[PDB]
């Protein structure tokens, strides 16, 4: 595999599950990991800790690519948002940019109905 110095970390942070995907700067995904994949289910995988460990796993996976610089793109609302980036930092990439990329419509599609609980 071709080594690459700089890339992006996409952090899809949902309410139920965090997904971290490291990619090159062009768009092509190198590796990924998830809180659900990291051995957490239901209550556990919707937590900051879980997200962090997913991030760590992802980092581990893209060791062979030899990535030093990293820009982070954080998507969605969740626990795995601050935690994940911290984890990434710990894992030892130079974090270059921290971007928020939550899809906010400018009033477009009707959301689903409100839950009655």
């Amino acid at each position: 595999r071709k080594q690459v110095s700089d890339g992006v970390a996409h952090i899809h942070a949902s309410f139920n599950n965090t997904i971290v995907t490291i990619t090159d700067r062009q768009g092509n995904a190198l590796g990924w990991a998830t809180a659900g994949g990291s051995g957490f289910r239901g209550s556990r995988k919707s937590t900051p800790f879980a997200a962090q460990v997913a991030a760590e796993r992802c980092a581990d996976a893209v060791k062979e690519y030899g990535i030093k610089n990293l820009e982070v793109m954080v998507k969605g609302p969740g626990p795995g948002r601050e935690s994940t980036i911290r984890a990434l930092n710990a894992a030892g990439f130079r974090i270059t940019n921290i971007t928020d990329v939550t899809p906010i419509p400018h009033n477009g599609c009707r959301p689903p109905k409100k839950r009655r609980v």
Binding site: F40, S43, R44, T47, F49, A50
Partner: protein
């Protein structure tokens, strides 16, 4: 309780070695307020243990205790629909107590004949890092590890 925290009561150190911890252990062991018998048993356990491992009576005991002390225990919050066991850092006073209690339980369980002998055996096991108390400790730790997500 709700209203007021209270200062822990005064405990006398045991006559043989002059130790608070030892005294506490003896107390824990004791049943039906028969302290003397319990203390004798404890002493016996110590002596045998000392013979086995060398060192001193007290030092060996301490070492044994060390191998069964829990860094972290769990508690049940249960805020959700289902129960969530949450880990908590267990304080110095409590940890020591817990280990002792576990040891005592192990001794009680054990299939050897005399109580003192059983206790000694348990201590030895603890020192070596096998046995019942140690297992219990591991389990406790394991649970905490499992539920580390909660904090």
């Amino acid at each position: 309780p709700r209203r007021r925290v209270i200062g822990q009561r005064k405990i006398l150190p045991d006559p043989k070695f002059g130790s608070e911890l030892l005294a506490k252990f003896v107390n824990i062991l004791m049943v039906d307020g028969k302290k003397s018998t319990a203390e004798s048993i404890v002493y016996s356990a110590l002596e045998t243990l000392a013979q086995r491992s060398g060192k001193s009576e007290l030092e060996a005991f301490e070492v044994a205790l060390e191998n069964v002390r829990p860094t972290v225990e769990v508690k049940s919050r249960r805020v959700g629909g289902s129960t969530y066991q949450v880990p908590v850092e267990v304080r110095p006073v409590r940890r020591n107590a817990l280990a002792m209690r576990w040891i005592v339980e192990a001794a009680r369980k054990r299939g050897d004949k005399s109580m003192a002998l059983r206790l000694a055996n348990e201590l030895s096991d603890a020192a070596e890092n096998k046995g019942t108390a140690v297992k219990k400790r591991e389990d406790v730790h394991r649970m905490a590890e499992a539920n580390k997500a909660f904090a």
